[PDB]
Write a protein that binds this ligand. Structure first.
Ligand code: MG
Ligand code: ZN
Ligand code: ZN
Lengths: 12, 50, 1338
């Protein structure tokens, strides 16, 4: 998904 | 000839593509992109050429 | 004891059986009474007691009860050392993925399941589903979904299918698959799709599945459900002075895991929404990944001081990990260091040691000796006696150090003469005293250097320090066999001043009775040292069977040489001292003394030379003044006569007669010439300018100028530096590399300008900066060489081959650069060579070619010998003593058990800091010889040849080749073969910007093979009127025209193609674009006429590229097999070329770009290996087409090309050792009942000793090919994982060894160094051998 950050994965 | 490899056609598509570059992994909205681009080089509190 | 080391994956039950209980909370210690909290990370019930034989509460003590477990606090009563051995564990609430087996490329999970890394890294972040079971539906196993498609499948199919998300899905996939069935179905379904691109990956996946099946592992253990916990004393929490604490980082990393696992165990009980439980599982995964390998899968977690935390993987790998910092080199007891200074009164086996250093280093010896003499009652009174420094302590110390050697060492240790053993002499003061003759092996001097001192303790270490390392066994070098103890700076000046002569010296003419009278006359003041006299002298020789015979004479000599002759031992000729000696003559003296007499006379003679040199240098009185630097009186005019020329060459530029580039490039050389004139005037005014008169009048002799005397004798200096002292300095370069126009016309005796000084600082800093940044490259190269060569040891006495390599001198590049004597001295003959007649046997055909055999070879003239080599030895796991030859530091055949790999690596690496980082004429008269030739007569009465690769040699009086060239193709040989021509005569003439290509036979030329509209123009030279159909460039190309590449051909009186004698050949060749052809149509020519023409880094980098086996970026193209060449199907990506055997199949044809000018025309017949183009050759091609000896010879010659250009001498078997280590792998071509696969890469020795047993009882073996790997790719591909893991890239090595299930047998040197055992080399070789015998017993 072109990202590995879990804070962005949460806020999305 | 540079103009002919762009996938962009107007201001909104360009802002969306810059946003996709700087912060991958979420779709932007009409205000998030404009604010992010207005923060980079054009705000005196996040930029200062001495 | 143990014999091997294993490695594998760990199941959950294995991790639970290492542990003593589960850690449940992040509590470390109590904040008021710093005691370990229960169930925390430092718990004393799990990990053991914090004091010796005490429980935590205090109920039990005092070692009466040693196995009891306290009932209050649970701590058992035992010794606290066990807090370094016991482990704990953590039970995870959801499985997580091990980061090594997921993100170390190639991933093992993605390789085992055949899934991309993107799909797995999307299922692992709860971001997509994955189908595990298909049921009976359209969906199938490992299909990827999204939430909406999952809902559709739910409401459409229902219960039948199965889809999951996260590491539980991946564990279910890894757990459900069947390995044997899958690998066997990859077997029979590869032969159809055995295309290369699929071949590589299919065989890789096959061998991975087979490794998992045979090793015993299970594929699902790559997903973690239990975690281990390191013992507390390896991650301590420790108080400092002041109440402050200090801690490790693993504590910080374990607490996060524990209290993110506890929160998930809470949320799974509150029955929270799934959007929150997913966020917990993601955070738990990220925390475990940062505990194992911190910066690998994202951003690195940092601490409260903004630095990344260190992890379990950073403590093993790198320059500061366990391997290189604590296991391959340590800190030691019984050692010291201090400043060094010179003592000139010492013998060669002696060093001066201060009294205080020796009292500290030798304390237990002194305690024991004191309480043996009854001088002290107990050891604690001996301590106070020593501490008070009584008088008997200094008498016990003198008999303790008597016959106790001491090892001295100076860093950096570039070779083995950096550590040597001496015998100590107690001194007062604080600096160490070193003998003046060993400062050259150490590279030491007395501007402030420091040295380290080590004390051997046991009997065996003392025996080895006396027999192997003592400084009086180390007189020869192990790289070349030369002496290492040569006298350097004032020995040389004193011996040179005492053996010079002078005209009209006081006491000239006398006749004396012997050396004693000459000495008695010099001491008395009656004669001079430089006086010409006649002395009676007795000298000895030995031609008898070990006996000396004497003879006396009267000789004409000086006083000083007669005085020096009292030092020389019995058995050497007088002609060695009758010269004016310098550094070279003294080295010759020492070497002939070593060859005739031996070791001990040599070590006495060296000391005597040193003493007398120092004494007479002192008596001479040599000094330096300002008037000793003499500037020639005609420099001031050479300078003006160059300045006038540069002015009159500027004014031919101001008026537009010359360009700027040529103006600059002319001023450059009209200054260089004037510099050379000044330097030669200076050197001639200084060298013999002494007019000393004699009995009647004046004459000339060599100068007694101080600077000239120390430059000419070889003590200090050169001509290039007196040039700057007394001449002019010269031309200076910019930091770019460009040369400034105006030179420095001044010298140091006169003084520079501000501007000349400023422009001279550039080169100074450039050199100073290159040195420091080159030392690192040199050290890194040495380390890679040592790692590839470390396990090679002389194992056997004779393998019994007949193979070898052909040694000849090297004569290229000019005169003979290397004689044949310097290349066979010490080697062993491979066959029974014969002096140039027939049956001139000198050999039992195993003959160590010592000096007498080399003299016998040189009194005859033979120029090729077949010798033995290590790259052709038949012994596996080692070399034999006969293929290696002579021990270059002992002078005899090598001993069995010697570590030749470390010596080879050190000898090649040590000098690496000095590396920099139109017509043929004939000199002397001799025969002319040609080879690789095919000839034809010319129209003008000369010789021409139609060979491209011929060789032209010059033959001496006896038939030894003295010079060898090769001619360009098409050149016309001025004179024929078999001629005895004198010097100064040209033999061939070629054009400097052109080469012609000639016809075959006299025939009639026709313009054919080309039309108008082709790549041909009708371009005629309008001024002179000469034109053929000229071939064009691609800028004037007509693509429809190049249907046939133009060429004008030769025909008969039949109008058709001419006969060529011997074969039904097409007589004419088609030439590539832009050819210059102006030959008339209708004007015919003879055989050999001008039909067409041809218009037209060293140092450490090159050595590193040769040993690493790089591929050049313009590699030449060679003939794969032998056959008739032609152009192929012409698919116009770029050109196509084919060859065709006269009998065999020809499916081989391939691509050549048109930029690559071909030198082989469609009528050529080529053999295997010859070039189809020009360019630097590639070593893999040289190994494939030609054999092993060709690539060996190429590598050793290209390496020695760099060392000889600087004056460095290295023997040639030291490079052959490395070349042998780069050739250890083979690749299988056809298995044939051999248990090997069909393109697997195997060790060469395994294939060899398998085929030797299959072929034994009548079976068909395997067929293979050899491989060439670089040094760092062959270090990593060895068959022991501990050596490879400790060299480089520890992560890849350990993951691959873990999934493969390897083991290690501890056969090299580094494996035994790591675990602290006796190495298999040297005095430890016998021990291991005996152990190996018990391996056959059991
Ligand atoms: Mg020094
Ligand atoms: Zn207790
Ligand atoms: Zn051998």
């Amino acid at each position: 998904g072109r990202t590995t950050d879990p804070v962005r994965m949460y806020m999305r | 000839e540079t103009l002919r490899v762009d996938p962009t056609n107007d201001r909104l598509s360009a802002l969306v593509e810059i946003y996709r570059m700087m912060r991958p992994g979420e779709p932007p909205t009409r205000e998030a992109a404009e604010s992010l681009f207005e923060n980079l080089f054009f705000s005196e509190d996040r930029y200062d050429l001495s | 004891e143990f014999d091997a080391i294993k490695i594998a994956l760990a199941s959950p039950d294995m991790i639970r059986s290492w542990s003593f209980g589960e850690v449940k909370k992040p509590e470390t210690i109590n904040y008021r009474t710093f005691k370990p909290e229960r169930d925390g990370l430092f718990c004393a019930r799990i990990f053991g007691p914090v004091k010796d034989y005490e429980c935590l509460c205090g109920k039990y003590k005092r070692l009466k009860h040693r196995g009891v477990i306290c009932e209050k606090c649970g701590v058992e009563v035992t010794q606290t050392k066990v807090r370094r051995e016991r482990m704990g564990h953590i039970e995870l609430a959801s499985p997580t993925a091990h980061i090594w087996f997921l993100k170390s490329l190639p991933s093992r999970i993605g390789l085992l399941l055949d899934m991309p890394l993107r799909d797995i890294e999307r299922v692992l972040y709860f971001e997509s589903y994955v189908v595990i079971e298909g049921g009976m539906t359209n969906l199938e196993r490992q299909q990827i979904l999204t939430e909406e498609q999952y809902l559709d499948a739910l409401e459409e199919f229902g219960d039948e299918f199965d889809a999951k998300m996260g590491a539980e899905a991946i564990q279910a996939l890894l757990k459900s698959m069947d390995l044997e069935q899958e690998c066997e179905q990859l077997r029979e379904e590869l032969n159809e799709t055995n295309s290369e691109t699929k071949r590589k990956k299919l065989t890789k996946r096959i061998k991975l599945l087979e490794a998992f099946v045979q090793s015993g592992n299970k594929p699902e253990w790559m997903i973690l459900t239990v975690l281990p916990v390191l013992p507390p004393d390896l991650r301590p929490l420790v108080p400092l002075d002041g109440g402050r604490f200090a801690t490790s980082d693993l504590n910080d990393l374990y607490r996060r895991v524990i209290n993110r696992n506890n929160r998930l165990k809470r949320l799974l009980d509150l029955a929270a929404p799934d959007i929150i439980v997913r966020n917990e599982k993601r955070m738990l995964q990220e925390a475990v990944d940062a505990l194992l390998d911190n910066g690998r899968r994202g951003r690195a977690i940092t601490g409260s001081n903004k630095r990344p935390l260190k992890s379990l993987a950073d403590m093993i790998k790198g320059k500061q990990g366990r391997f290189r910092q604590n296991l391959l080199g340590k800190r030691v007891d019984y050692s010291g260091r201090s400043v060094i200074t010179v003592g000139p009164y010492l013998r060669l086996h002696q060093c001066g040691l201060p009294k205080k250093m020796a009292l500290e280093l030798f304390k237990p010896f002194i305690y024991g000796k004191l309480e043996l003499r009854g001088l002290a009652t107990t050891i604690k009174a001996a301590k106070k006696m020593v501490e008070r420094e009584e008088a008997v302590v200094w008498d016990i110390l003198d008999e303790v150090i008597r016959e106790h050697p001491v090892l001295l060492n100076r860093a950096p240790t570039l070779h083995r003469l950096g550590i040597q053993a001496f015998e100590p002499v107690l001194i007062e003061g604080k600096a160490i005293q070193l003998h003046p003759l060993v400062c050259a092996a150490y590279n030491a001097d007395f501007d402030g250097d420091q040295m380290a001192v080590h004390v051997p303790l046991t009997l065996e270490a003392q025996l080895e320090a006396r027999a192997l390392m003592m400084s009086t066994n180390n007189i020869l070098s192990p790289a070349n066999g030369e002496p290492i103890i040569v006298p350097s700076q004032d020995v040389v000046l004193g011996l040179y001043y005492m053996t010079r002569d002078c005209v009209n010296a006081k006491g000239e003419g006398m006749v004396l009775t012997g050396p004693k009278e000459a000495e008695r006359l010099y001491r008395s003041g009656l004669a001079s040292l430089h006086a010409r006299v006649k002395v009676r002298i007795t000298e000895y020789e030995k031609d008898a069977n070990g006996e000396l015979v004497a003879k006396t004479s009267l000789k004409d000599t000086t006083v000083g040489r007669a005085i020096l002759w009292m030092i020389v031992p019995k058995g050497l000729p007088y002609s060695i001292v009758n010269q004016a000696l310098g550094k070279k003559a003294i080295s010759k003296m020492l070497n002939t003394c070593y060859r005739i007499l031996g070791l001990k006379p040599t070590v006495i003679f060296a000391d005597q030379i040193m003493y007398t040199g120092f004494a007479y240098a002192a008596r001479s009185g040599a000094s330096v003044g300002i008037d000793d630097m003499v500037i020639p009186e005609k420099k001031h005019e050479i300078i003006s006569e160059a300045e006038a020329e540069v002015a009159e060459i500027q004014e031919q530029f101001q008026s537009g007669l010359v360009t700027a580039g040529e103006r600059y490039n002319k001023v450059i050389d009209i200054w260089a010439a004037a510099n050379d004139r000044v330097s030669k005037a200076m050197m001639d005014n200084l060298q013999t300018e002494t007019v000393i008169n004699r009995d009647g009048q004046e004459e000339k002799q060599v100068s007694f100028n101080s600077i000239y005397m120390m430059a000419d004798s070889g003590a200090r200096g050169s001509a290039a530096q007196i040039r700057q002292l007394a001449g002019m300095r010269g031309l200076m370069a910019k930091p770019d590399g460009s040369i400034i126009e105006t030179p420095i016309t001044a010298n140091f005796r006169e003084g520079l300008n501000v501007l000349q000084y400023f422009i001279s600082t550039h080169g100074a800093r450039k050199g100073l900066a290159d040195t420091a940044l080159k030392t690192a490259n040199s050290g890194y190269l040495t380390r890679r060489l040592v790692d590839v060569a470390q396990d090679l040891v002389v194992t056997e006495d004779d393998c019994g081959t007949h193979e070898g390599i052909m040694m000849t001198p090297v004569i290229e590049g000019g005169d003979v650069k290397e004689p044949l004597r310097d290349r066979v001295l010490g080697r062993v003959t491979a066959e029974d060579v014969l002096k140039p007649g027939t049956a001139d046997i000198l050999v039992p055909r195993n003959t160590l070619l010592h000096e007498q055999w080399c003299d016998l070879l040189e009194e005859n003239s033979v120029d090729a010998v077949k010798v033995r080599s290590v790259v052709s030895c038949d012994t596996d796991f080692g070399v034999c003593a006969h293929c290696y030859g002579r021990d270059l530091a002992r002078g005899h055949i090598i001993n069995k058990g010697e570590a030749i790999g470390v010596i080879a690596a050190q000898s090649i690496g040590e000098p690496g800091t000095q590396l920099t980082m139109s017509s043929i004429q004939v000199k002397n008269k001799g025969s002319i010889k040609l080879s690789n030739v095919k000839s034809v007569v010319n129209s003008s009465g000369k010789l021409v040849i139609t060979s491209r690769n011929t060789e032209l040699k010059l033959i001496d009086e006896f038939g030894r080749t003295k010079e060898s060239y090769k001619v360009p193709y098409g050149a016309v040989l001025a004179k024929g073969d078999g001629e005895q021509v004198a010097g100064g005569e040209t033999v061939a003439n070629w054009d400097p910007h052109t080469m012609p290509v000639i016809t075959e036979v006299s025939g009639f030329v026709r313009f054919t093979d080309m039309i108008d509209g082709q790549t041909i123009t009708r371009q005629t030279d309008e001024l002179t009127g000469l034109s053929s159909l000229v071939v064009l460039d691609s800028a004037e190309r007509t693509a429809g025209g190049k249907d046939l590449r133009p060429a004008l051909k030769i025909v008969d009186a039949q109008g058709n193609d001419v006969l060529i004698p011997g074969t039904d050949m097409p007589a004419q060749y088609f030439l590539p674009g832009k050819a210059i052809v102006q030959l008339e149509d209708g004007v015919q020519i003879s055989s050999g006429d001008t039909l067409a023409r041809i218009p037209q880094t060293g140092g450490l980098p090159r050595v590193a590229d040769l040993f690493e086996a790089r591929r050049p970026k313009e590699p030449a193209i060679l003939a794969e097999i032998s056959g008739i060449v032609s152009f192929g199907k012409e698919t116009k990506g770029k050109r196509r070329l084919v060859i065709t055997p006269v009998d065999g199949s020809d499916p081989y044809e391939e691509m050549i770009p048109k930029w690559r000018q071909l030198n082989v025309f469609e009528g050529e017949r080529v053999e295997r290996g010859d070039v189809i183009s020009d360019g630097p050759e590639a070593p893999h091609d040289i190994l494939r087409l030609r054999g092993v000896h060709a690539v060996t010879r190429y590598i050793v010659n290209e390496v020695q090309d760099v060392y000889r250009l600087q004056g460095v001498k290295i023997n040639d078997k030291h490079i052959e050792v490395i070349v042998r280590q780069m050739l250890r792998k083979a690749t299988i071509v056809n298995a044939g009942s051999s248990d090997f696969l069909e393109g697997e890469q195997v060790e060469y020795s395994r294939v060899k000793i398998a085929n030797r047993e299959l072929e034994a009882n009548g079976k068909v073996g395997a067929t293979y090919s050899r491989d060439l790997l670089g040094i760092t790719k062959a270090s990593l591909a060895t068959e022991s994982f501990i050596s490879a893991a400790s060299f480089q890239e520890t992560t890849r090595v350990l993951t691959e060894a873990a999934v493969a299930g390897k083991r290690d047998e501890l056969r090299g040197l580094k494996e035994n160094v790591i675990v602290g055992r006796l190495i298999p080399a040297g005095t430890g070789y016998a021990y291991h051998q005996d152990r190996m015998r018990r391996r056959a017993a059991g």
